Design a protein around this nucleic acid. Structure first.
Ligand SMILES: [Mg+2]
Ligand SMILES: [Zn+2]
Lengths: 227, 717, 81, 687, 23, 62, 224
DNA sequence: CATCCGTGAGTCCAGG
């Protein structure tokens, strides 16, 4: 019997169930599809940043509650879609008392911020904050030492780039009892994505992506198979 | 769950399947329905799949030393002819897979299945009725797998680095989701110390107060932590609501976690939680890299150096006896000591020379299994072997097993090893007999009432008094106090009462009494409560299994017998002492006890010990006759110094043990009375199981002892 | 708060135990009613006046014990000792 | 079970039996190892059970003197010089002398090296003694052990406890479809098989004049011909498969005493108790936890661990009081579908396949002319079918058994075959089973490392080496250092070196580690056989050395390192395992504890004649026992109804069990149990 | 070689030369 | 005497019991298991044994 | 931070060929070749013998007069037989040889569409007066299908069902060259290795592997 | 405090 595709939901993430796979294929399909969603989907994230009132890291920014550290982390969680491959730059300025968010961000053209309610930094009175952001495009996860020369050396800060629009994926493989055979494999897959793309879509691109690879092998003969 | 063979089920549910065959018309009558099953027609496999729906069955594994030897499971049909078993009930059944067989019984009556699913089901009996400890816990691979990821590796890759120069802070992640993509790229080690913001794990009790003011942590509130990615993956199991643990998971650690969950969290939580812990270990025990090669097992560097030092000390002792300056009994007695010390120094040589990487040590030091003594025998040296008599041989096996034992070495070890198995076979037959006796003496002992109502209890030593100051936790605390319910309000120096009467002692209530400084509490016991038949629920107290008050009807007597008999195999005093006590024999030692309290008059002769006692209160001198082979017991005197041997002019209380050995409990009865003799027995019994590291709750011993004193003789008609 | 109870761990026994004096009592409580349900299904075939049928929806091919054990959880049954 | 098993059986030394002692009479002194057993009776071979120390095996070089004592060969030392003259000594005679251990270094002439040597003395006491005073010396280092014990490679590395099992268990090995000689050996594998008598040895020298699967004929030199008939597919006492195949090809010149045809568990005249398996020492996703074992499906698809098992079924036709039983193909109320596999007689046809329940021998007997049921009388008037006076007493296939009918043996009293008084036709039907290895089958090595098969993964799921080769068997690392039996490890190392081959480096001379190593081993082929005799053989130095010498595979790459480990790829995830895993080849035996035998269950069945309880055992289709101990387990729980039900309607309530069956099949409620017939019996026994 | 007495396969032995008497 | 007889020294127990004309009240664990009566423990005691279970008045057929 | 469609090169050897694939995602190569390895060993179509019949033989456990091997060792020799059949339906081969001499895979008579790929394979050593007449049934399929399945169908008592190893694949593996140099030059190079049974080519093998996988991942692209 | 007779000495399975 041909295999089915199912879905149990949640706004940001959902679980997918594939069954019945020919015995020993649940694992044949599992880890391969995960490393695809986590690495083989292009998005946009922050490469480097620049703060006005900073000449070294340990000191906090004049007028801000959070440390230099706790801001970077808040900024890594920022979700953004850029339209052009080449590195763009966006500016976020705000002064006085209150809280600065992702709706305060001034974006270029064809560049969208998808969670304008994300907290970033709690400014107090007489508190100034000017930040230059460097947004690129890529795949998966890229360290900070590899971005150590992407801003003006008057306070250029390298950031961990989380290009991937998929956040975390886990998978289990139980067995389904088809006919008399209890051997058949049942694949369960948990997928959490950013606020950028629906998980239901992130799979379809991840799915289509892999179809391309196995095209190469298939191209030779297209001999035999049945579904 | 359990994996019940497709073939096995069909014969177990045979008239049950025949029923649904003539139901769904596969067979015209009951006779044909039979023939369909016996021919194993294809239909029945569909039929039977329905029949065994949530219909519990029994798993028994002989020998059944305690009641967890029979547990109920939800049967899962399975291809093959083997019974599939859950790795956590292995501790309860004492079941390994070197060819063990288990018996299955199919409950039929409505109440039977009810008794199965509710009383006996494996996911309910997670605790030992003997000590209340978690038997269904991570055991071998599991612990070794968890102990892996929860370890902190100093210089491992992806470790947190402070900012300095032109490079900022390396090793800070926004979320667990990020750190996971890091070890997948190959930047972050799952065992390297890092800093990560967390959103679905309540911080420590000490940090939550600092960061929230105990505003009540919430799924979504953020905070920063200094762990390893692994220790985070581990806390996603405990899961939410439970205070994060930042330690490495040794067995004793994990044991605490579950025991805590056993108290606070409900049963179905623990069952689900411990299951998650199982899956975790196995997956990580695989990628733990724990392997045995000839390489990992290393002989020490100081091997021949150390052994040449003691063989030289030996030859000195040989020549000192060659001149006949030494007694023969002294010669070996010293030779034993020389080689005992030597083996210790070989072990030391290993531990340090061995990296904590080393899988043989990783397994030992992590409580997964194995002793270091084993590891010593493997790569260090065997050491002393036992004589047929039992005494330790003057000659030592210098060879390790890695180096290969010499021909003459192998022989004598073998002698030892066989005599080992022989006694191991005899004690079982002994333990099993002592057990069946205990079972009979306490069958009519049941929880019949909810409360005796008497204020009678017994004193327990909560803690010792430090000479310098402060208080020291009493060692017997866990077995003699923790499960008891109070019989008298426990008050400190003030008029302030810390714990009420009718209140179960728990872990924090001992901490309340410990910090208050009070070191003695009167607690209700099975020895004291008096009821027509059996005992009462209130005096017994907390059923070690449930972790709550014992239900009315519990066959506490049998379970008490089981509790004491189940581990009676692991002894060397020894098991005879346990028998000699429970059978109340006039002991071997026969150490005297003082009839009346007064001033001691030591008048030793070289041919015979004689002890005289002058009555503190008026009275006439009472004098005893002692054989010089025994020696006077170092009793804790008024001087608060226990190590003071008996000396003349000392002061002894009434019934005080005069010399080392064992006291006749029949005299303790006539001298110190019915109550005191029960407490003597219980702790003398306990002392035996103490030595061999076995912890039974005083509760169980008391149940048996109670049934020894229920009769009184007839003096005059 | 916990994961969804599967199979024979449902209904969660802790919540069941809350509705009864002690473990032993829950057994006879349930089974006697499970006997009532099975009486009902056989009697109904040829005789009225049976014990009251399943107070909840029977799952497809649900054992009488499983029915009774669920309605105990629904507090739809009364408890005399 | 296997030739060795029989061989050891002939050399058992039992203390039990008439004139001997009882099992309860024996204390702890009779059983433990005595000093005088040296070279006479093995200290390792003995049962694990309650029979421990009361049964032993006779040592290898031992013999019995005309007065029933046990002598042993020792070498004679004149004055510090070993003489080839050998004298056998009884126990107390060796006590009056002084013996040097076999491995004490000896001059090329025959003189000792050091003045003071290792010396055995009366009362099992040992001391260094000047060479002037050495009387005798041991024949061999392996002199103390038995035939079975000496087949345990690196024995001196395994604690007596597991080593003991390792000897006891080899006699439990089952003959496989075809057998491989172990890559690692001790030398004993040869002589054990020949002496066992379950192979075929040539009496006089000659040349193979004709060879067939059936027999071997040998043309002697003197002109005479001796033909050896082959045992082919014969049932042993234990239902294992004693099948002999010819070694020699036609026209081979063969000398006397040579093995011309080997039998079960014998490869080229050597004891082949098992197969050589590619092992991997690692916990693998829990499926090997607590000594269980993981297998590659290769072992199932290539019959590597597959055996034959023959059963024998009997049935006879006696004279009864109602006539005589007659074996016929006409059985009351059975279709021509069930009878389809019989012949005209009533016997199943050779080559047919049988399942349990099926009919092997159609036998009917005349039933007593008692008044048939008035309800069945009525049922016979409607359908007008007259009842037959013959009741079905057929021989059907027992539960569990199944296979192909490989031979019928018919005896008749008619054909003058002399039968016991009362019997007429007597039939035997032999069925063979080709049992492939399955879950629950008990595998073991030679080191007491036992365990049942936990999971058999698809061949692709198996952790594999870089060149694609999937390992065969995944043992759990956890259960190795605890058992003190690192012999299994050492064997694995030497196993790999023997699979790949090796070559010591002779440039710049012969290395100092391989200095003691005999010339013949300095260069070794792939799949080479070697010997590690007990208390001799490989030393840990040489073994470490050989791991560096390991020859590369066909792709020119070395596979394992000097540590002996190698890198694996998890066949499931694809990602490589983080740490190097100890890989190598280990010899594994298939013990005679297979689930196909061991599994059993019963609903209702036969019942006891007196106590009216169920009968006992698989052979009787009896039920399990719920013992005194087990009842305690019920009471402790407080499962009063369960416990009762088992002791009442499930056991010996005559009227209850019948009405419980009705209640179940009618789908009603279970009734209230009655009185135990056993208890009734008790009161009659008291009365 | 070990037992070079029957006509058996050559199994190479790590050894000290054992020539006292055959099994 | 039932409990004693099935424990040890059965011949000793029976001779004595038959002389003292001892009646046995079958009220014990051992005692009950023998005759097949529900053991006086756990779900065997009357407290739990005699239970009536009824649907709530609030619960009524649809 | 780079985009390039991947390649699929080839370096050959008659029975076994290495397939090179680059440039792939970082840390992706391993769990990519593995997905293939598990496709090949398990679900690549081929053909092998299901059952046989021998003159004078009624079951697997007997001997034929004059032949060196028993039927069991003969059926056990025939396992290593390498056959490729095109007939999707079952076909019957033949083997008859007499007198002295050796019998081999060559002496098998394959019908229309059946080709033996290892004629030198030893089957039995027929001594003088030895006659061997066999009849072999060949089908098509994939993976491994046990003998025991054939007997229950309706097979006559003459036939002797044999296990069927259809997988024409022998030994497969992979290695990966990941450039981890700190730059946007970080990629993975996959080198797959396939060895077959000379029943099919290493390339054809990988082809039917891809044809299978494509029809599997395609279900991930279909909308709800 | 030491002798003479009688009573105890783990469970389940298996087989002949
Ligand atoms: Mg065991
Ligand atoms: Zn009370």
């Amino acid at each position: 019997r041909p295999t089915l595709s199912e879905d149990v939901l949640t706004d940001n993430r959902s679980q997918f169930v594939i069954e019945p796979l020919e015995p020993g294929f649940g694992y044949t399909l599992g880890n391969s599809l995960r490393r695809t969603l986590l690495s083989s989907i292009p998005g946009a994230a922050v490469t480097s940043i620049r703060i006005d009132g900073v000449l070294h890291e340990f000191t906090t920014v004049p007028g801000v509650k959070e440390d230099v550290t706790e801001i970077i982390l808040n900024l890594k969680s920022l979700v953004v879609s850029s339209e052009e491959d080449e590195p763009v730059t966006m500016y976020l300025r705000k002064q006085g008392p209150g809280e600065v968010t992702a709706g305060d961000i001034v974006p270029p053209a064809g560049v969208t911020v998808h969670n304008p309610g994300m907290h970033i930094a709690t400014l107090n009175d007489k508190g100034k904050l000017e930040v230059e952001l460097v947004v690129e495009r890529g795949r998966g996860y890229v360290p900070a030492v590899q971005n150590r020369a992407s801003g003006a050396e008057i306070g250029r800060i390298p950031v961990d780039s989380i290009y991937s629009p998929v956040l975390k994926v886990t998978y289990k493989v139980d067995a389904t009892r088809v006919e008399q055979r209890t051997d058949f494999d049942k694949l369960i897959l948990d997928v959490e994505t950013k606020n950028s793309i629906s998980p239901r879509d992130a799979l379809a691109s991840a799915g289509k992506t892999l179809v391309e690879l196995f095209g190469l092998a298939r191209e030779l003969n297209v001999e035999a198979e049945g579904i | 769950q359990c994996g019940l063979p497709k073939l096995m089920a069909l014969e177990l549910f045979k008239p049950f399947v025949m029923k649904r065959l003539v139901d769904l018309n596969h067979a015209q009558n009951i006779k044909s329905a039979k023939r369909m099953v016996e021919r194993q027609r294809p239909q029945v496999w569909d039929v039977l799949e329905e029949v065994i729906a949530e219909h519990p069955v029994l798993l028994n594994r002989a020998p059944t030393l305690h009641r967890l030897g029979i547990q109920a499971f939800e049967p899962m049909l399975v291809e093959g002819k083997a019974i599939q078993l859950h790795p956590l009930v292995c501790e309860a059944f004492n079941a390994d897979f070197d060819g063990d067989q288990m018996a299955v019984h199919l409950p039929l009556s409505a109440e039977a299945q009810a008794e199965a699913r509710i009383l006996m089901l494996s996911s309910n009996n997670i605790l030992s009725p003997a000590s209340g400890r978690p038997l269904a816990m991570p055991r071998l691979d599991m612990v070794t797998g968890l102990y892996y990821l929860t370890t902190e590796v100093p210089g491992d890759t992806g470790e947190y680095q402070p900012a300095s120069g032109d490079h900022p802070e390396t090793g800070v992640y926004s979320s667990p989701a990020e750190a996971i993509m890091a070890a997948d790229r190959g930047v972050l080690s799952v065992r390297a110390k890092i800093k990560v913001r967390l959103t679905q794990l309540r911080p420590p009790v000490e940090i939550e107060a600092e960061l929230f003011g105990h505003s009540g942590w919430q799924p979504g509130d953020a905070w920063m932590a200094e762990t390893t990615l692994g220790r985070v993956m581990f806390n996603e199991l405990l899961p939410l609501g439970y205070p994060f643990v930042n330690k490495q998971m040794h067995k004793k650690v994990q044991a605490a976690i579950i025991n805590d969950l056993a108290e606070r969290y409900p049963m179905i939580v623990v069952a689900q939680t411990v299951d998650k812990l199982k899956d975790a270990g196995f997956y990580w025990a695989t990628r733990s890299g724990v392997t045995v090669s000839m390489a990992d097992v290393l002989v020490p560097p100081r091997k021949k150096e150390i052994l040449d030092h003691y063989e030289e000390r030996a030859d000195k002792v040989e020549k000192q006896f060659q001149r006949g300056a030494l007694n023969h009994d002294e010669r070996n007695e010293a030779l034993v000591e020389i080689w005992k010390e030597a083996t210790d120094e070989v072990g030391q040589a290993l531990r340090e020379h061995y990296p904590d990487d080393n899988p043989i040590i990783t397994i030992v030091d992590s409580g997964a299994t194995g002793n270091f003594t084993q590891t010593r025998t493997l790569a260090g040296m065997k050491g002393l072997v036992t004589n047929p008599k039992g005494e330790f041989i003057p000659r030592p096996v210098k060879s390790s097993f890695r180096e290969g034992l010499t021909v003459l070495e192998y022989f004598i070890n073998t002698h030892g090893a066989r005599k080992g198995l022989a006694d191991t076979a005899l004690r079982t037959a002994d333990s099993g007999y002592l057990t069946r006796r205990l079972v009979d003496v306490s069958q009519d002992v049941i929880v019949r009432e909810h409360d005796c109502q008497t204020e009678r209890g017994i004193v327990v030593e909560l803690a010792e008094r430090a000479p310098d100051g402060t208080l020291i936790r009493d060692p017997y605390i866990e077995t003699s106090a923790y499960a008891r319910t109070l019989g008298t309000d426990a008050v400190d120096e003030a008029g302030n009462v810390i714990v009420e009467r009718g209140q179960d002692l728990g872990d924090p209530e001992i901490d309340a009494l410990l910090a208050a400084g009070i070191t003695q509490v009167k607690v209700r016991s099975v020895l004291t409560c008096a009821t027509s038949t059996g005992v009462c629920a209130t005096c017994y107290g907390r059923s070690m299994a449930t972790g709550k008050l014992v239900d009315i009807g519990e066959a506490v007597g049998i379970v008490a017998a089981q509790s004491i008999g189940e581990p009676g195999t692991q002894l060397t005093g020894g098991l005879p002492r346990v028998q000699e006590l429970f059978e109340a024999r006039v002991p071997r030692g026969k150490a005297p006890i003082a009839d009346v309290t007064g001033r001691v008059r030591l008048e030793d002769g070289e041919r015979f010990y004689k002890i005289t006692i002058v009555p503190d209160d008026g009275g006439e001198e009472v004098v005893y006759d002692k054989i010089s082979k025994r020696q006077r017991l170092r009793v804790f005197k008024h001087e608060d110094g226990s190590e003071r041997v008996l000396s003349d002019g000392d002061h002894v209380e009434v019934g005080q043990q005069l010399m080392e050995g064992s006291a006749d409990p029949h005299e303790v009865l006539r001298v110190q009375g019915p109550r005191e003799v029960q407490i003597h027995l219980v702790r003398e019994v306990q002392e035996v199981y103490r030595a061999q590291g076995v912890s039974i709750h005083d509760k169980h011993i008391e149940v048996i002892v109670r049934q020894m004193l229920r009769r009184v003789t007839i003096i005059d008609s | 708060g916990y994961d969804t109870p599967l199979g024979i761990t449902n209904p969660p026994i802790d919540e069941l135990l809350d509705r009864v004096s002690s473990k032993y009592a829950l057994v006879i409580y349930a089974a006697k009613r499970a006997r009532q349900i099975n009486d009902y299904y056989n009697q109904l075939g040829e005789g009225i006046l049976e014990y009251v049928g399943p107070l909840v929806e029977p799952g497809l091919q649900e054992k009488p014990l499983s029915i009774a054990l669920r309605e105990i959880h629904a507090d739809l049954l009364e408890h005399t000792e | 079970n296997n030739p060795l098993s029989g061989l050891t059986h002939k050399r058992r030394l039992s203390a039990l039996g008439p004139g001997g002692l009882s099992r309860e009479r024996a204390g702890l002194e009779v059983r433990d190892v005595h000093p005088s057993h040296y070279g006479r009776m093995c200290p390792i071979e003995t049962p694990e059970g309650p029979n421990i120390g009361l049964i032993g095996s006779l040592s290898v070089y031992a013999r019995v003197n005309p007065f029933g004592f046990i002598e042993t060969p020792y070498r004679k030392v004149v004055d510090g010089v070993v003489s080839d003259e050998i004298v056998y000594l009884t126990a107390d005679e060796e006590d009056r002398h002084v013996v040097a251990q076999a491995n004490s270094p000896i001059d090329a002439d025959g003189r000792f090296v050091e003045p003071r040597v290792l010396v055995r003395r009366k009362a099992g006491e040992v001391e260094y003694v000047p060479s002037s005073e050495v009387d005798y010396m041991d024949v061999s280092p392996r002199q103390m052990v038995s035939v079975a014990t000496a087949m345990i490679p690196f024995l001196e590395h395994d604690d007596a406890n597991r080593a003991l099992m390792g000897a006891n268990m080899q006699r439990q090995a089952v003959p496989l479809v075809r057998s491989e000689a172990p890559l690692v050996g001790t030398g004993m594998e040869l002589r054990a098989a020949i002496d066992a008598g379950d192979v075929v040895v040539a009496e006089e020298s000659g040349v193979i004049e004709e060879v067939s699967a059936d027999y071997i004929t040998v043309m002697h030199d003197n002109g005479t011909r001796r033909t050896y008939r082959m045992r082919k597919f014969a049932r042993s006492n234990h239902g294992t498969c004693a099948n002999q195949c010819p070694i020699v090809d036609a026209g081979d010149r063969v000398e006397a005493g040579q093995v011309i045809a080997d039998g079960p568990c014998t490869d080229d005249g050597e004891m082949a108790l098992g197969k050589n398996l590619l092992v991997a020492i690692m916990p693998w996703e829990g499926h090997n936890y607590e000594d269980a074992i993981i297998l590659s499906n290769r072992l199932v698809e290539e019959d590597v661990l597959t055996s034959i098992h023959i059963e024998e079924h009997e049935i006879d036709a006696r004279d009864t009081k109602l006539g005589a039983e007659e074996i016929t193909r006409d059985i009351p109320n059975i279709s021509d579908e069930v009878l389809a596999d019989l012949d005209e007689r009533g016997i199943v046809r050779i080559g047919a396949e049988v399942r349990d329940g099926d009919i092997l021998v159609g036998k009917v007997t005349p039933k007593g002319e008692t008044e048939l049921t008035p309800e069945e009388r009525l049922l016979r008037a409607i359908f007008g079918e007259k009842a037959r006076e013959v009741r079905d007493t057929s021989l059907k296939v027992p539960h569990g058994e199944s296979g192909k009918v490989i031979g019928i043996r018919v005896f008749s009293r008619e054909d003058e075959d002399e039968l016991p008084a009362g019997v007429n036709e007597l039939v035997r039907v032999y069925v063979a089973q080709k049992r492939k290895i399955s879950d629950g089958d008990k595998l073991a090595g030679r080191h007491g490392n036992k365990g049942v098969i936990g999971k058999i993964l698809p061949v692709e799921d198996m952790p594999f080496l870089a060149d694609g080769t999937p390992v065969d068997i995944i043992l759990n690392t956890h259960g190795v250092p605890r058992r003190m039996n690192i012999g299994q490890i050492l064997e694995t190392h030497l196993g790999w070196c023997a699979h790949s081959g090796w070559k010591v480096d002779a440039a710049k001379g012969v290395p100092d580690w391989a200095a003691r190593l005999p010339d013949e081993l300095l260069e070794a082929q792939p799949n080479a056989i070697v010997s590690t005799p007990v208390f001799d053989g490989a030393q840990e130095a040489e073994l470490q050395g050989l791991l560096s010498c390991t020859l590369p595979n066909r792709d020119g790459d070395v596979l394992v390192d000097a540590d002996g480990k190698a890198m694996l790829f998890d066949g499931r995830s694809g990602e490589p395992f983080p740490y190097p895993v100890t890989v190598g080849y280990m010899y594994i035996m298939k013990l005679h504890h297979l689930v196909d035998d061991k599994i059993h269950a019963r609903s209702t069945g036969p019942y006891s004649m007196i106590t009216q309880q169920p009968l006992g055992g698989k052979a009787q289709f009896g039920g399990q026992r719920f013992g005194e101990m087990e009842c305690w387990a019920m009471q402790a729980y407080g499962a009063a109804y369960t416990l009762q039900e088992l002791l009442t309607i499930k056991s010996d309530d005559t009227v209850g069990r019948v009405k419980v069956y009705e209640a179940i099949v009618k789908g009603e409620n279970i009734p209230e149990p009655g009185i135990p017939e056993s208890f009734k019996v008790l009161l009659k026994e008291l009365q | 070689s070990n037992n070079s007495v029957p006509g058996a396969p050559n199994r190479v032995s790590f050894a000290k030369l054992r020539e006292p008497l055959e099994v | 005497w039932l409990s004693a007889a099935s424990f040890q020294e059965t011949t000793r127990v029976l001779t004595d019991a038959a002389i003292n004309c001892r009646s046995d009240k079958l009220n014990g664990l051992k005692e009950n298991v023998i005759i097949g009566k529900l053991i006086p423990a756990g779900t065997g005691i009357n407290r739990y044994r005699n239970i009536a279970v009824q649907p709530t008045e609030e619960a009524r057929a649809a």
